[PDB]
Symmetry: C3
Subunit: 491 residues, 3 copies
């Protein structure tokens, strides 16, 4: 009963987590959290974004009005989902700069179509084809009007349609490419047709292409599709002496967050802000390894499959040399704090957590967690990142831009976790050392550092005395004479 | 009079500045500096870059030689400033790949035009139009030569111009699309014209299409503009049976720092390396939030409106636990240093700054300031970043490249400031602790740490004695007997 | 002989290395390593990548089968090396979108050519030209078939070639533009020809343009080159009434790591994963300043010519204030450790390295080295980064993408080295301090800190005694009474 021992320590856990730091690729901490989202349910949630399942309809075919796509008339979407099983079943066509028209319509997010009163004098309208059947009957794109000769004449068509509204109009039209010179003359009379579609400030002027091509649904001819945007106060003009596949009206254009995605994932009734072709994913983590293609408020795509952020101190079953240093060992029985005191005196032994030092470490770790885990990434219509055809220069560049981006963000994520982990380990070591130093300072000349995180207190120090040290009210003067006598033999 | 007190401390100010760190979203430091430039004067400075105000002339119209644009003949610029009020007033035209021609001329930075001795046998030159008046007279683009029939014949033109120089020549030429067959035959005799412009390494052939486009300044036809660059030792060949709008010569091409910007900001007499469409901005800060479009030595565009870099210690009106730790409190009355000493002795009280510790903290902070705010970003001709029309694929990519860039730099700036501030707080805490420890070591057995940054010195220690401690010359041996006697009663 | 001195210290070297940190642009460390590769041997190593030296053949000429390029028939490569001296020696031609065809063939990595059963009824095959000699005899591109009239007739050609395989076929074909009407008629009978090449999903119709171009190898006519990819289950059709330069079969298409590089560096026998136009470079460093154009597992291109990473402590011939702090001075005579002890006792003087602290510092530094210099960057076919012609919009974007990437990586590299160096200086300072503190703790009341990294041990401490302190088994209880006496005169 003439001396007491007061030992400082920190908690420990039976199963820790291995994390990476600046100096160690593998080091065990008490707790960590995963920063990379690597799983999806495999389904696209239908809220909060308006999802339109294209089913067997490509957006381009829903736009032109392929007969199997009539149910998509006037549809809207935040995200149009294009299925790989979708196919075209109308007159065979191509779209110079297909990707751009698909993109601009996808971004517009509506197929709202307004029929206009184009006057086509002196021609036969509403041409139909065995390539574009409605049941057994010949048919054609709903939004296009295939004009041919009337009697022995195809006149010079010259028509206008002013835009007197306050929104932009999108016109989609085509040019028919016959298989032979004979077909050219049979349909259009003139041996060389031409289609010129213009506004006051722009024009597209096209000549038909003649030649036999592989039969598609019985047809060797083809249509090429073009588009024209007409702004308020501007006007559409169409001038043709043959081969014109006319528009029936315009699509309203909108701006907003709409886009299109290629996916075969089923749609489900649930809520998720982030969508990938693999399905919706949670956005609670800052990074994800599910797909570079995303839509909505999403974690950033990185190459890593896991990045673990330490959320507790080193686990011992640092710059300051306290944790895993002069303190040999963590305490598994300390579950109400991160740091604390054990003591041994006349009245027995005991353990108490230190609230203030525990809270300081927790507050600092929560601070970095809040910084890191803060959702900051919301992107909608972007660039394409997977490609079905070889194209060369433009595709090389699109791929390189995305690859460059991913490599830079993977770098940021890797560094972030290594630096943060090194600092977490160092600040928790720091808090342990600061509590030790504060205790040392309280004790003045009445105790000695045993070298293992323990003080030998050279006087009788009962439970209330120990509590005075723990709560920062120890009065060293009260015990000094006793202590100096015991330490040094002074009186 | 037999003991003294020596206290260590650091300065503080009544009102500090809130900054962000890795672990704290809000923490008060003594001083900080702003890293984001958020303001402009609203004017473009006319030095040091050569600014050319386009006024009511688009670069394309100054190039072709629209009659309202004669003052721009042979102009040069580092930055051509294009105003939104600019309009065209000549024959209605379009430029396939308009953006590319505008870009390459802008980047070249000169409209220096060299008239060449082209021979046009058998045609009428200098065609003119009511759409392009010069005063009361019909006129045409100054740099183009509208060729028409002579008598009842328009011959096959076949002309050459070798490049015997050692620089590239830019030729700008056009093809006329008449409104009607009557106009075509009246001008060119041939029912269908053709233009082929070739060199040894390239060829461009355009077959115009006849048809009405909207009436513009009385004209329903259009001219389409094309260009050809002829390398040293190569040869221009022009071949046409009608519809050629011929060049009169070539434009000189240069490489350098020239570009073009769309802005409605007025030009002013002043100096500024950095120009934005909003006006010039200072470049003393590393980041800016004014505009992603810039020219010259500019701060990097980021999303943040403010980023405060700590340039002083924590303000108390750290890893080491001195500042805001065992030192309870900063000293507002300490104004000639950052760290220092106060004492109470036989002669009274006093205060003195510690120069070495003050200077060490200041040098380290100036070090990071020099590193951070060092101007290292100078960009001239870049890509466009705002767009007046919907285009689809290439524009999607241009937008994505820029958004990607901005998000990465915004990340770098945010991390930089958080890391630097955390480190600044820690290094200033460190310097305080090191000064305390140095003082403790000098005192040996002659003093005890009171636990609050103060030492009780256990001997008579007058002003000279205190100064010996402050200046690092204290001789502990001189006072050891006296001190040990007071502490322990040894005598 | 009643006391001993034990001094702690660290090594130093006479000439250290100057590095940069967060706080100092220049600070000397004992050792550093260069992170930027700035040199090449100037030769391209022929392993492990399959390098194909194009010699005087551009890939495009090797593809078409220019007579000087016959040795490249059916070649394959990982990297095609294109020389600046390469020239074309066949009929003059141009390739609309040349860069894309060059890119896609380069990326495919093979010229494997399969002859197919095209039947050309009623025409003369194997046309040849004096512009395209094989020795003294006229010749033509080996992979193309120049068809001309047979007798007095050139009939409408109409042929098909199904893709019944499970791979993609690349067809390369051409259209002849005669110089004169006389030539057109002599070769093809029809006054105006036409070439239509199609599949089920695509079509191209090219109309030849008759007219003079500048003479190249005796020819004022030109051939234009086009290509068509035919997927499994699709069908190629070719339909023409003149001017067709027919394919003889297809090139097999592959995907993989192949690319093309412009370089004049010789190829030699050696091994190198990374190739630049300057020659191969080692990939042991994470960064390089040799060339932005690279192929293989390469360091990342940065703007800096040098970046030195500290791999040793501060050199003295920190946050903790030990190194270049209370320890005045490093020890050059310490060659078997980074930290250690010198002593002075009755038996003389001595020195010993401390293994554990030395190893702790080394292990931490090796940890960051392994992290930093870990080869993680491997790129194959990318985008072009140097250009011979002005092009405008697409080239502006390619350049901007590459410049953006480089500035971001240069930033990352600069920050990495500054941060790592600051931390290395601090952790080595920490390790010195930790050793000092551990020693202090062992000695208890038996020694005093002299303030300069040395302990005065206040008792007889022979060689065995010193060694017990160095190996951590010192028993302070044995000497405590003797020590307190010398210290205060208490025993
Ligand atoms: C100065 O610092 C450099 C960089 O750390 C030291 O060079 C490094 O030395 C180590 C040990 O010799 C090398 O590690 C070894 O690498 C080989 C692979 O070749 C491996 O088989 C060994 O088991 C060991 O891992 C390391 O490669 C080498 N690095 C470089 C860039 O040379 C150098 O030793 C230091 N000098 C002094 C005097 O401390
Ligand atoms: C281990 O670390 C995780 C990460 O912080 C802790 O989980 C957090 O707990 C707090 C408090 O309940 C919640 O507010 C957060 O939402 C949780 N975050 C996550 C990502 O789940 C967890 O509590 C820690 N475990 C222990 C035993 O401390
Ligand atoms: C040009 O060649 C094609 C291919 O041989 C011919 O098209 C075939 O015609 C038959 C009946 O007319 C169809 O059953 C085949 O399916 C067609 N094949 C393809 C690939 O389309 C075409 O008739 C020929 N044209 C001329 C004018 O002879
Ligand atoms: C083709 O149609 C356009 C549009 O109706 C005609 O252009 C109009 O012509 C009248 C008479 O000159 C003008 O008053 C209008 O301003 C014109 N409108 C536009 C939009 O240009 C054009 O004349 C017709 N062309 C032919 C050959 O009949
Ligand atoms: C068009 O003009 C060019 C230039 O004079 C002619 O090409 C030259 O023809 C002569 C002999 O006919 C050659 O010796 C020259 O080398 C050619 N020059 C070039 C640059 O090719 C061309 O023949 C003319 N074409 C017509 C149809 O008259
Ligand atoms: C997502 O789909 C892609 C292919 O579309 C696949 O490579 C990837 O492994 C998938 N990820 C998950 C988590 O299923
Ligand atoms: C605050 O920091 C800035 C940046 O170094 C400096 O210019 C200014 O003088 C500082 N103010 C004080 C009072 O130190
Ligand atoms: C600069 O101009 C843009 C308009 O493009 C505007 O959005 C921004 O608020 C302006 N900033 C300042 C500081 O004037
Ligand atoms: C590599 O080549 C480039 C381009 O030719 C040149 O600018 C650079 O100086 C070269 N570098 C070395 C190290 O040879």
């Amino acid at each position: 009963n003439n001396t007491a021992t007061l030992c400082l320590g920190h908690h420990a856990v039976p199963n820790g987590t291995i994390v990476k730091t600046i100096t160690d690729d593998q080091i065990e901490v008490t707790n960590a959290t995963e920063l990379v989202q690597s799983s999806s349910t495999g389904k696209i949630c239908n809220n909060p974004h308006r999802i339109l399942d294209g089913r067997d309809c490509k957006l381009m075919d829903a736009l032109l009005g392929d007969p199997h796509c009539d149910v998509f008339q006037d549809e809207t979407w935040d995200l149009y989902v294009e299925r790989s099983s979708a196919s075209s079943n109308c007159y065979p066509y191509d779209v110079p700069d297909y990707a751009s028209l698909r993109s601009l319509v996808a971004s517009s997010g509506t197929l709202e179509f307004i029929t206009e009163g184009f006057t086509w004098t002196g021609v036969t309208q509403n041409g139909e084809s065995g390539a574009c059947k409605r049941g057994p009957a010949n048919g054609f794109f709903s939004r296009l009007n295939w004009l041919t000769k009337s009697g022995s004449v195809y006149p010079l068509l010259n028509v206008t349609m002013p835009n007197n509204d306050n929104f932009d109009k999108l016109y989609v039209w085509g040019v028919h490419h016959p298989s032979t010179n004979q077909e050219q003359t049979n349909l259009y009379v003139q041996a060389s047709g031409r289609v010129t579609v213009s506004t006051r400030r722009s024009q597209q002027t096209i000549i038909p292409n003649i030649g036999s091509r592989p039969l598609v649904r019985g047809q060797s001819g083809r249509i090429s599709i073009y588009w024209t945007i007409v702004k308020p106060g501007d006007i559409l003009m169409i001038n043709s002496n043959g081969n014109l596949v006319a528009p029936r009206g315009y699509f309203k254009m909108r701006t907003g967050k709409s886009s299109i995605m290629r996916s075969n994932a089923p749609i489900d009734t649930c809520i998720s802000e982030c969508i990938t072709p693999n399905g919706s994913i949670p956005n609670d983590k800052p990074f994800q390894n599910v797909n570079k293609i995303t839509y909505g408020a999403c974690p950033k795509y990185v190459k890593q499959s896991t990045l673990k952020l330490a959320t507790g101190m080193r686990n011992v079953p640092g710059l300051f040399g306290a944790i895993a240093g002069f303190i040999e060992n963590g305490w598994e029985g300390m579950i109400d704090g991160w740091y604390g005191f054990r003591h041994k005196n006349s009245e027995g032994t005991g353990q108490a957590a230190d609230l203030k030092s525990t809270q300081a470490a927790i507050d600092q770790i929560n601070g970095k967690l809040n910084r890191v885990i803060e959702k900051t990434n919301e992107k909608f219509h972007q660039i394409e990142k997977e490609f079905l055809e070889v194209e060369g220069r433009i595709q090389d560049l699109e791929k390189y831009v995305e690859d460059t981006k991913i490599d830079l963000w993977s770098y940021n994520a890797e560094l972030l976790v290594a630096l943060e982990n090194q600092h977490t380990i160092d600040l928790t070591d720091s808090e342990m050392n600061k509590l030790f130093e504060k205790t040392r300072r309280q004790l003045r000349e009445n105790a000695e550092d045993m070298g293992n995180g323990c003080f030998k207190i050279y006087h009788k120090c009962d439970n209330a005395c120990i509590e005075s040290i723990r709560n920062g009210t120890y009065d060293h003067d009260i015990y000094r004479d006793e202590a100096l006598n015991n330490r040094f033999q002074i009186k």
